[PDB]
Write a protein that binds this ligand. Sequence first.
Ligand SMILES: O=C1N2C=C(c3ccc(O)cc3)N=C(Cc3ccccc3)C2=N[C@@]1(Cc1ccc(O)cc1)OO
Length: 190
Amino acid sequence: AVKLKTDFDNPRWIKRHKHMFDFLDINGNGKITLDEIVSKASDDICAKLEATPEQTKRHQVCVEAFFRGCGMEYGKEIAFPQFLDGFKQLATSELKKWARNEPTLIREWGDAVFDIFDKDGSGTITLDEWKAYGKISGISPSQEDCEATFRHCDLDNSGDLDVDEMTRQHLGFWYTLDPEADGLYGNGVP
Ligand SMILES: O=C1N2C=C(c3ccc(O)cc3)N=C(Cc3ccccc3)C2=N[C@@]1(Cc1ccc(O)cc1)OO
């Protein structure tokens, strides 16, 4: 039973996103742009994961939608406070879709990442594949933290992760500060 109640004023939820913001703020001037974010997704991440042009584009579209959901746009610098209020709007919009049994932006982003890793048609992500993602995206480079993610989640009998489980975890991790989601990224993200 995922937590659907928001906790936007919680110091821990704020710090989780402040951590992500600072992680995306390259030169550390206290601001980020959609340009820099999409570049990371397409020129860096997708390239190293050897995604096809179509997979790269699908992934790009998902990222653009996720961050535009935070009020971000190309050519505009965003400061943390504004980024955070934007994230609160994305979160409520996502929870509304969840309440309507409509696919969320984080679920669709997940589908795009999972497809890039869908080779033998496993339709899932293995520990090694996630380890690669953690390193290439930079969100969780430590092998230990990636192993912590898999120990944290409910895996199938083969030890692989499925998109519904990751979506479920992410909804609680990014949006509602679900106690069940705490620890999702080991020490990689608070
Ligand atoms: O969830 C994810 N992320 C959340 C945030 C993020 C950023 C700012 C916030 O305030 C909060 C969260 N940043 C990145 C990393 C990234 C950023 C920009 C472009 C590409 C990648 C990121 N990568 C994901 C991708 C993913 C999505 C669904 C899945 O099922 C599996 C994997 O795996 O962690």
